[PDB]
Each structure stands twice: as structure tokens, then as C-alpha cells.
Amino acid sequence: SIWDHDFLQSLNSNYTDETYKRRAEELKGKVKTAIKDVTEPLDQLELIDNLQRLGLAYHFEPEIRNILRNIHNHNKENLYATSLEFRLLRQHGYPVSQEVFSGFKDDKVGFICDDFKGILSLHEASYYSLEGESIMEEAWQFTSKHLKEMDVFVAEQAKRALELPLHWKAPMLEARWFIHVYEKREDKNHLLLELAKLEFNTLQAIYQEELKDISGWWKDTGLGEKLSFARNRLVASFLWSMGIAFEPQFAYCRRVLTISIALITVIDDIYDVYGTLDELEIFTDAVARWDINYALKHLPGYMKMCFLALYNFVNEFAYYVLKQQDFDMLLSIKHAWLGLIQAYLVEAKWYHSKYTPKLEEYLENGLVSITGPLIITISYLSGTNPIIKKELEFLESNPDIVHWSSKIFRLQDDLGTVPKSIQCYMHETGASEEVAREHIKDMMRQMWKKVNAYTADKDSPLTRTTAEFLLNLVRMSHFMYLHGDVGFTLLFQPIPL
Amino acid sequence: SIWDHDFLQSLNSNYTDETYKRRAEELKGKVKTAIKDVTEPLDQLELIDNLQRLGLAYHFEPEIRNILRNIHNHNKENLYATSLEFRLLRQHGYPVSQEVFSGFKDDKVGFICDDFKGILSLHEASYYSLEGESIMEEAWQFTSKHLKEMDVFVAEQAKRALELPLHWKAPMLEARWFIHVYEKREDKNHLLLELAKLEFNTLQAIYQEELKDISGWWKDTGLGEKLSFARNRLVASFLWSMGIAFEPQFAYCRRVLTISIALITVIDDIYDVYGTLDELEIFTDAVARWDINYALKHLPGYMKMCFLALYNFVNEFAYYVLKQQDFDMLLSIKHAWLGLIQAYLVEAKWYHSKYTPKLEEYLENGLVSITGPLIITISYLSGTNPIIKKELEFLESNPDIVHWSSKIFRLQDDLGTVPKSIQCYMHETGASEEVAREHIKDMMRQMWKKVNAYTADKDSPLTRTTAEFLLNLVRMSHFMYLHGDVGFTLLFQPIPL
Numbered sequence: 001s002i003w004d005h006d007f008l009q010s011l012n013s014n015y016t017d018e019t020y021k022r023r024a025e026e027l028k029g030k031v032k033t034a035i036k037d038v039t040e041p042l043d044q045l046e047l048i049d050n051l052q053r054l055g056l057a058y059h060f061e062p063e064i065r066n067i068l069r070n071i072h073n074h075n076k077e078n079l080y081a082t083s084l085e086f087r088l089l090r091q092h093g094y095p096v097s098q099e100v101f102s103g104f105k106d107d108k109v110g111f112i113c114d115d116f117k118g119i120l121s122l123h124e125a126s127y128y129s130l131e132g133e134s135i136m137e138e139a140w141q142f143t144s145k146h147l148k149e150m151d152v153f154v155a156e157q158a159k160r161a162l163e164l165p166l167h168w169k170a171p172m173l174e175a176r177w178f179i180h181v182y183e184k185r186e187d188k189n190h191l192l193l194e195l196a197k198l199e200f201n202t203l204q205a206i207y208q209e210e211l212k213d214i215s216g217w218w219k220d221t222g223l224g225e226k227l228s229f230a231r232n233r234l235v236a237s238f239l240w241s242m243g244i245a246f247e248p249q250f251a252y253c254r255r256v257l258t259i260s261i262a263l264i265t266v267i268d269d270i271y272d273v274y275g276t277l278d279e280l281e282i283f284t285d286a287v288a289r290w291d292i293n294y295a296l297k298h299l300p301g302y303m304k305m306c307f308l309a310l311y312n313f314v315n316e317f318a319y320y321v322l323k324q325q326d327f328d329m330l331l332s333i334k335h336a337w338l339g340l341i342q343a344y345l346v347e348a349k350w351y352h353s354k355y356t357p358k359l360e361e362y363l364e365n366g367l368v369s370i371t372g373p374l375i376i377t378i379s380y381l382s383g384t385n386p387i388i389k390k391e392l393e394f395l396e397s398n399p400d401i402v403h404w405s406s407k408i409f410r411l412q413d414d415l416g417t418v419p420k421s422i423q424c425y426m427h428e429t430g431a432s433e434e435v436a437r438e439h440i441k442d443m444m445r446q447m448w449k450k451v452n453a454y455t456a457d458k459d460s461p462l463t464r465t466t467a468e469f470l471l472n473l474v475r476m477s478h479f480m481y482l483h484g485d486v487g488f489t490l491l492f493q494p495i496p497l
Numbered sequence: 498s499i500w501d502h503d504f505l506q507s508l509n510s511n512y513t514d515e516t517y518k519r520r521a522e523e524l525k526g527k528v529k530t531a532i533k534d535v536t537e538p539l540d541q542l543e544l545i546d547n548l549q550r551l552g553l554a555y556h557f558e559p560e561i562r563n564i565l566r567n568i569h570n571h572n573k574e575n576l577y578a579t580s581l582e583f584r585l586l587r588q589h590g591y592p593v594s595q596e597v598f599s600g601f602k603d604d605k606v607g608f609i610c611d612d613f614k615g616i617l618s619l620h621e622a623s624y625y626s627l628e629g630e631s632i633m634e635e636a637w638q639f640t641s642k643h644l645k646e647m648d649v650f651v652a653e654q655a656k657r658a659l660e661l662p663l664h665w666k667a668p669m670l671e672a673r674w675f676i677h678v679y680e681k682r683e684d685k686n687h688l689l690l691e692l693a694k695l696e697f698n699t700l701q702a703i704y705q706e707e708l709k710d711i712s713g714w715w716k717d718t719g720l721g722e723k724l725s726f727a728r729n730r731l732v733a734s735f736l737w738s739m740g741i742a743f744e745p746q747f748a749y750c751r752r753v754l755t756i757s758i759a760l761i762t763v764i765d766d767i768y769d770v771y772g773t774l775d776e777l778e779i780f781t782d783a784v785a786r787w788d789i790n791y792a793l794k795h796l797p798g799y800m801k802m803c804f805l806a807l808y809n810f811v812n813e814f815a816y817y818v819l820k821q822q823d824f825d826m827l828l829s830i831k832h833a834w835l836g837l838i839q840a841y842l843v844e845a846k847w848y849h850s851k852y853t854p855k856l857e858e859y860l861e862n863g864l865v866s867i868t869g870p871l872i873i874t875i876s877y878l879s880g881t882n883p884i885i886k887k888e889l890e891f892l893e894s895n896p897d898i899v900h901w902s903s904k905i906f907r908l909q910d911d912l913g914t915v916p917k918s919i920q921c922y923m924h925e926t927g928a929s930e931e932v933a934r935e936h937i938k939d940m941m942r943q944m945w946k947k948v949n950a951y952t953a954d955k956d957s958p959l960t961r962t963t964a965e966f967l968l969n970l971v972r973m974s975h976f977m978y979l980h981g982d983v984g985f986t987l988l989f990q991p992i993p994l
């Protein structure tokens with residue numbers, strides 16, 4: 001908790017200034033010209049891979065779209081080239097058959113390859129597998145096992161792919177690591193690299209300015225002073241919101257998300273630590289009524305400021321959207337908050353009854369209590385303009401993509417550890433904790449196949465942009481499972497020059 | 498409406514800096530030493546008069562208290578000296594008999610005096626008259642008539658006393674005018690004057706900083722953009738709150754008051770101009786319920802943001818006091834807001850029925866609709882720490898001092914002009930508008946006698962500090978009746994050197 005309010009207010013990055021924003025525009029135009037001159041399809045695919053991994057892809061969206069749309073129209077015997085095209089096309093919603101890998105797979109003896117580069121790209125592409133694509137499953141089985149066996153760069157490349165594949169990491173999180181790798185490359189575009197370093201440093205400056213604003217708001221509520229367990233988690237919460245929506249236009253989305261996660265953290269500590277069962281029933285009822293007079297009349301003292309802070313914050317949230325685009329979402333947003341709170345009470349009742357639920361019964365409640373349903377609702381209302389009534393109702397209908405994404409989120413948090421996923425699974429199968437962890441890791445990978453189908457469904461009310469919020473939340477949980485300061489490195493540490 | 502958000506943000510007074518605050522402390526100590534050396538009672542009384550009229554009296558409260566407490570223990574044939582002592586002692590709550598003026602009053606022919614200086618001081622003292630003190634009433638009759646008959650400074654002195662006596666003006670409003678008069682004085686204390694100019698300029702800097710903060714809050718709600726009739730009245734509202742509570746420690750009181758008055762102004766325009774009767778019944782009901790879900794469900798579109806802005810603002814107000822001193826005042830503050838709103842609906846129903854009420858029936862509703870009861874409640878909750886439960890309940894009991902102060906406030910606003918006080922009185926007595934205005938001015942002076950009694954009552958739950966909020970609000974209405982830019986001169990125009 002070193003990065004308190006005073007530290008945040010004292011930051012003064014140079015990259016907020018106007019000179020850098022001029023140079024970035026100059027570089028963007030110069031880069032767009034260089035993209036034109038890449039015409040060979042493999043160079044086109046390697047360019048997109050580099051652009052996405054440098055955190056620059058959102059500047060060149062139509063340019064990337066042309067390249068992929070063109071390659072799809074024309075659609076090797078190269079495993080690297082086949083796997084890279086497969087990954088990129090599936091990532092951006094195009095249909096590619098799993099049968100493109102059939103040439104490298106022998107029916108009797110399985111996959112045949114010795115090239116690490118082709119194996120690494122196939123491993124990345126395997127996470128874009130759909131449900132029931134047995135070639136891709138065997139491809140993952142073959143690639144993971146080969147990668148586990150493992151020149152210094154090959155060892156690190158193999159290590160990173162095993163702990164976190166590209167499909168499971170948000171764009172900006174890998175940006176700093178990949179920026180160095182790109183400057184070590186001999187065939188690097190020098191202007192492309194200079195832009196990657198410049199935009200990365202400018203984003204930090206933007207985030208730091210937002211943190212000052214959010215830091216002052218948190219100080220004004222004074223929950224940290226009132227509640228000794230309300231440790232300042234502001235920077236950690238912003239890290240999550242930043243991974244959910246990193247683009248500069250999503251500043252209001254990151255603000256609502258950061259504050260929401262900070263409040264969620266305090267309320268969660270009240271339910272699964274500090275609150276008695278009778279107190280938790282009153283707080284749940286007060287949230288359900290959404291009546292400030294009732295809450296002040298019946299809540300315990302320590303719960304009052306916590307409820308009122310949440311109450312006013314959400315009502316201000318409803319006011320902001322009402323002013324901005326004349327949309328009333330108060331019923332929706334407080335409904336989602338109640339769902340989270342009710343799932344907390346279910347977990348508290350289980351704990352006091354000493355009831356160990358079956359894993360599936362736990363996951364049914366656990367997918368809501370991990371805030372997946374609430375967070376995607378917050379992200380949609382605070383990050384979309386105009387709000388579409390059809391699209392919001394689809395989220396309120398408990399859709400399948402939210403169902404399975406939240407399950408991965410819940411399973412991933414429990415791996416970092418009331419009884420949770422690991423204890424439920426051990427109790428249910430008799431497996432050891434070590435084995436139980438491996439099976440839970442596998443469930444997440446199998447559930448990502450279900451999620452891949454819903455992303456490709458273009459008949460769903462959810463846009464791809466709305467779906468990215470949900471995936472990035474899940475991706476953020478994968479990332480935070482590896483790292484407990486990387487968050488300090490992401491927000492407060494510029495890249496030199 | 499020249500002083501918009503952009504003008505307020507661009508101000509950068511030099512007097513916020515630390516050097517001036519050093520010199521002020523040096524001057525305060527040097528002045529306290531000079532006060533010791535004044536020992537003659539008339540010089541002691543003239544010193545207090547100068548200190549109060551320079552806006553410096555709150556720095557030397559115990560020093561003034563000693564002087565008055567000492568003079569009361571020892572308690573001329575000088576009308577000026579008798580009238581000045583009478584005014585100052587009654588102003589600060591000491592008992593002085595009206596019989597101190599009996600020497601200058603002949604039973605058959607009335608008051609005997611030719612000295613303008615003694616007449617001017619008696620005129621000021623006459624406003625501290627109590628109910629039924631026939632000497633003081635005759636003193637006012639004699640002094641006002643003599644003053645009406647009216648060397649350039651005597652004419653201005655006589656003019657100012659007739660339009661606004663000392664008892665009816667807030668301290669800082671007269672400060673700039675009196676500061677010049679004091680520097681023209683030959684026997685001036687030079688350090689006393691330098692302090693008066695310095696504190697006046699420092700207060701402007703403090704107010705300007707508060708205005709920036711309040712200006713940004715008003716911009717964020719966006720009511721001025723939503724409602725074409727919601728003209729920016731922020732600077733005008735702050736002027737009122739500043740006259741209600743000018744001291745630097747009352748920054749939060751001025752903030753809540755300014756925003757409250759800004760919201761009152763918009764809501765008042767909705768009731769007595771723009772809203773239909775059915776719409777006003779829903780808004781009144783929504784305020785009575787204090788239910789955000791109901792309001793969004795049933796209110797017209799244009800009323801929604803106006804209600805929600807008020808709703809969140811008051812709930813944040815309740816939150817701030819709860820965090821600060823663990824006091825719950827939500828029931829009280831929303832009760833006072835409902836009383837104002839209900840009085841608005843009464844006036845709207847009268848207007849649509851074309852019913853001209855009797856003046857007393859109008860004043861019964863009019864004293865609430867002028868916001869007197871609400872404003873004193875806001876001032877107490879936002880300007881007192883700790884809040885006393887006994888003292889608040891006394892305000893909620895509709896006490897007499899609030900009853901008569903609000904009546905003066907209501908009568909004074911109607912003089913600046915649905916049918917109001919002047920039309921009701923004309924309709925009721927057949928008097929002409931010119932005569933009706935004179936009678937209404939007299940009512941206010943007779944009602945100030947009732948208010949003087951309640952101020953002197955030391956058995957009331959209200960402290961003198963709480964009573965000053967109420968009187969300063971009334972005093973502010975007297976001041977704003979004379980001036981429609983004096984408000985610009987008060988806040989944005991420093992005194993040189």
C-alpha cells in the first residue's frame with residue numbers, strides 16, 4: 001500500500017505535454033505508409049502480430065481489417081505460417097477449419113514436428129479451438145507436452161506461452177516485454193518501435209491523471225479512515241479496470257470500474273470476514289430495497305457509511321448516464337449489485353452451516369459472487385454510448401457467454417488461494433490438492449472453448465466491443481494469478497526514450 | 498451572467514500566498530497591544546464600533562468582550578455617547594434600559610437635539626428597540642424625520658442610515674465603504690487600517706478558491722445545459738451564503754448554501770413559471786417519498802435531472818455530516834426541503850384558482866416559501882460541529898425567531914417586485930401601491946422588535962452563533978433589495994495596497 005493519495009498527487013509525467021502528441025501523429029501517418037508497402041501475406045500476418053503485441057493495434061484497425069479480409073478471400077505446408085494465420089483469423093472472427101492442420105498430423109502417431117517456431121505458433125492457435133475440435137485439442141496436448149520438456153530466448157518464449165498464452169492476456173499487459181523483444185529484432189521497423197514506446201508512455205500519463213481524480217474521490221468518502229480493514233486498494237482496482245478497458249476514450253469506464261471494485265472489496269470483506277449473519281441479512285435487504293431512509297434506520301453503524309457510499313455512487317452513476325445520453329439504467333445497475341450481494345449471502349450461509357457444496361452448486365453461485373455479471377454490466381453502462389436497450393436486456397438475461405466467462409473467473413481466483421473450488425473438488429473426487437489444481441486448470445481451458453463459440457456468434461445482441469470487456473476481465477484474472485510489482489511497472493515506470 | 502465557469506477558474510489572486518498571512522498575524526498582535534492602551538470608555542466604545550465596521554471584529558472577540566463586560570459593570574448627558582453605548586451593549590446581549598434616553602426627551606414636546614452626530618447614533622440605536630419600548634419608537638420617529646430633511650459626508654451618512662441601518666447589514670458588506678472612511682480619518686490607527694485592507698483582500702482570495710470548486714460542481718450536473726431557464730446564478734447564490742456565513746471556517750457551510758440556493762432557484766422557477774399543476778403534484782410527492790426509483794418512474798423528463806441532482810446532493814450532504822461527526826440528519830434536512838416544496842405548491846394552487854389571499858394567510862405560507870426555515874436548517878447542519886440534538890429539534894419546532902425572521906425576509910423580497918404582499922395588502926385595505934410599500938416597510942421594522950427579544954432570550958436552545966445565521970439571512974435580503982455590480986465589487990475587486 002505504498003502508493004497512497006499523496007504519491008499519486010505528486011506525479012508529473014512529461015508525456016502529458018503536447019509535443020509528444022504531435023510526434024505520435026507524425027509517426028502514425030508514417031507507419032500507415034509503411035503498412036501499404038507490405039504485400040506478401042506472411043509479412044502481412046507477422047505485421048499484425050507485431051502491431052497487436054506492441055499495443056498499437058487500435059490505431060490501425062481499418063488497415064488490419066483490410067489485410068485479414070484480403071487474406072480470407074484468397075484462402076502452405078508451413079506449420080508456423082498455418083498456425084499464425086489460423087490464430088489471427090479466428091481472433092478477428094473469420095471462419096477457419098481445424099482441417100488446415102491435417103497435413104502435419106498422422107492418424108496413427110499424431111503430430112509430426114521438430115521446429116520450435118512452428119510448435120509455439122500452433123500452441124497459441126490451439127487456444128482458439130472450438131468445442132469438439134479434436135485436432136486442436138490433440139494439437140494442444142502435443143504442443144504443451146513438447147514445450148514442457150524445455151537458446152535462452154527459446155526457454156523464455158516456451159515458459160511464457162505455458163503460463164499465459166496470447167489469447168488469455170490483455171493487449172497492453174504484454175506491451176512492455178514485447179517492446180524490448182522488438183528492438184532486439186534486426187528487421188524491426190524503427191518508426192514502429194518509436195511509436196510503441198511513445199504511446200506506452202503517453203498512456204501511463206493519462207492513467208496517472210485519472211488516478212489523481214479517483215484518488216481524491218476515495219479520500220473524500222473516508223471509508224479507509226472509518227473502517228480499519230478498508231485498506232487502500234485503489235491502485236490495485238484501477239489495474240483491473242485498466243485491463244478491462246485500456247483505451248483513452250474509456251476514462252469514465254475506468255473511473256466507475258475502479259470505484260466499483262474498491263467498494264466491492266470492502267463489501268466482500270464485510271461478508272466473508274467481519275459481518276455477523278444477522279447484520280448481513282439487513283445489508284442485503286437494504287440493497288434490495290434501495291431505500292436510504294430504511295438503511296440509516298436499521299443498519300449497524302459500521303455498515304452505514306459503506307452502504308451510503310455505494311448508494312450515492314451508484315445514483316451519481318445513474319445521473320451521469322441520464323445527463324449524457326438520456327438513458328435510465330438505475331433499475332439495471334442496482335439489480336446487478338443486488339445479484340452480487342445475494343450471492344455473498346449464500347456463501348455466508350453455507351459457511352455458518354459448515355456445508356461443503358458440490359463444485360457445480362458452488363460454481364453456480366460462485367460465478368455471480370466473483371462479480372463477473374456485475375462487472376460486465378458496469379462496463380457496458382459506463383463504456384457504451386449510445387446504450388442499446390436490446391443489448392442490455394441480453395446481459396440481464398444471464399447469457400451463456402457471461403455464464404462461462406464468470407466460471408473461468410471464479411475458478412481462476414480460487415486457484416490463487418469458506419470452502420472454494422479446490423476444496424469442493426477434492427471433497428467430491430478424493431483427489432489430492434496438486435491433482436485438483438491441474439483438473440481445475442483444465443476446466444478453464446475447456447470452458448474457453450465454449451466462450452470462443454459465443455464470441456464467433458454474430459447473431460448475438462452483444463457487439464464484439466461489449467464482448468471484449470468480458471474477455472478482458474477474465475484475461476485480467478489469468479494475469480493477476482501470475483503476479484501476486486508489475487502493476488507499478490505498468491502504471492508508474494516509463495520506457496526510456 | 499458574465500462570471501461564468503471559465504472566468505472563475507482563471508482567477509489567481511496574490512493574497513492566497515503565505516507572505517500576507519504572516520504579515521496579518523504580525524498586525525493582529527500589534528493591534529492587540531494597541532487595544533490595551535485604550536482605557537477611556539468612549540474611546541473603548543468607538544474602538545469596537547470601528548473594529549466591527551472594518552470587518553475585523555471576529556479576530557478580537559475576547560478583547561471586545563472584556564471592554565463591554567467592563568462597561569456594563571460600571572454602568573453621561575451626551576446623546577452620541579449614550580446612543581453608542583446603548584447600541585453596542587444591546588447588540589452583544591447586555592441589558593440597557595430605554596430610560597437612558599429620558600434626559601433628552603421632553604414629555605410635552607418630545608426629543609430635543611440639534612447635533613447631527615448624536616441624532617445619527619440614536620437612529621442606529623433605535624433599531625435595537627424592543628417591543629413596546631415607546632421611548633425608542635419615538636426616538637426612531639424623531640430621528641428618521643430629522644434625517645429625511647437632509648456637509649457632503651453628512652448627506653451621505655444620513656442617506657446610508659435611512660436606506661440601511663447598522664443593525665440590518667451583515668458585517669463584511671459595509672467593510673469596503675467604511676475602510677475608506679477610516680483612512681480619511683485623522684486619528685486613524687494606521688496598523689488597524691492596514692489590517693482591515695489585508696483581511697478584506699485575503700477573504701476575496703478564499704472565496705474565489707471556493708467558487709472554483711463550487712463552479713466545477715455546478716458544471717458537472719449540467720442542469721444549465723438541460724434546462725434553458727436554468728441560467729447560471731452561481732455567483733449570486735454564493736453572495737447570499739457569504740453574507741449568511743462569511744468566516745473562513747464556514748467554507749463547507751457556504752458550499753452547501755450556495756448549491757442549495759442554486760437548486761432552490763431552479764425549482765422555484767419550475768413551480769411559479771414552467772410546471773403544470775399536475776407535474777408539480779408529482780414533484781412534491783416525489784420529494785415527500787424521497788424515493789429515487791419512484792421519481793424516475795413517474796416524473797416528467799425535464800423534472801428528472803432536477804430532482805436527482807437535488808436528491809444526490811442532499812444525500813451527499815447527509816453522508817458528509819455522518820462521516821464528520823457521526824450524526825444522522827437526513828430526516829431533518831429532507832423534511833425542511835419538503836416544507837419549502839409544499840409551500841411552493843400552495844402558492845401554485847392559489848395562482849391557478851385566481852385566489853387573492855389575505856396578507857396574514859399569505860405570510861403564513863410565504864414565510865416558508867421564502868426559504869427562511871430551510872436556509873437556517875441548512876446553515877445549522879452545515880455550519881455547526883458538534884450538532885446538538887436539542888438545538889436542532891428547537892428549529893424543527895417552528896420557533897418564533899424563525900417565524901418572524903422569515904416574515905421580514907418574505908416581506909422584503911416582495912418589496913423588490915401570483916399575488917404577493919403588496920397586492921394582498923392593497924386588495925385588503927384599499928391603499929395605493931405607494932402607501933402599501935410604506936406600511937410593509939414599517940411592518941418589517943416592527944417585526945425586528947419581536948426578533949430582538951428572541952435574540953436576547955438566553956434560555957432558548959439556539960446559541961447566539963446559530964441565531965446569527967438567521968439574522969444575516971434577513972440582513973442579506975435588506976442588502977439585496979438595494980442592489981438589483983456590488984457583488985462583483987465584493988468578491989473580485991481587491992482594495993489596493
Ligand SMILES: C=C[C@@](C)(CCC=C(CF)CF)OP(=O)(O)OP(=O)(O)O
Binds near residue numbers: 264265268272370375
Ligand atoms: C481480494 C480481492 C478479490 C475480491 C478479487 C479482487 C478483484 C476484483 C476484480 F473485479 C474484485 F472485483 O478476491 P476475493 O478472494 O477476496 O473474492 P472472494 O471472496 O469472492 O473469493
Ligand SMILES: C=C[C@@](C)(CCC=C(CF)CF)OP(=O)(O)OP(=O)(O)O
Binds near residue numbers: 765769866
Ligand atoms: C429570484 C430569486 C429569489 C428566489 C430569491 C433568491 C435568493 C435566495 C436566498 F436564499 C433564494 F434562496 O426570489 P423569488 O422572487 O424568485 O422567490 P419567490 O418566487 O418565492 O418570490
Ligand SMILES: [Mn+2]
Binds near residue numbers: 268269272
Ligand atoms: Mn473474499
Ligand SMILES: [Mn+2]
Binds near residue numbers: 268347369
Ligand atoms: Mn466472498
Ligand SMILES: [Mn+2]
Binds near residue numbers: 413417
Ligand atoms: Mn478468492
Ligand SMILES: [Mn+2]
Binds near residue numbers: 765766769
Ligand atoms: Mn419566483
Ligand SMILES: [Mn+2]
Binds near residue numbers: 768769841866
Ligand atoms: Mn415562487
Ligand SMILES: [Mn+2]
Binds near residue numbers: 910911914
Ligand atoms: Mn419574489
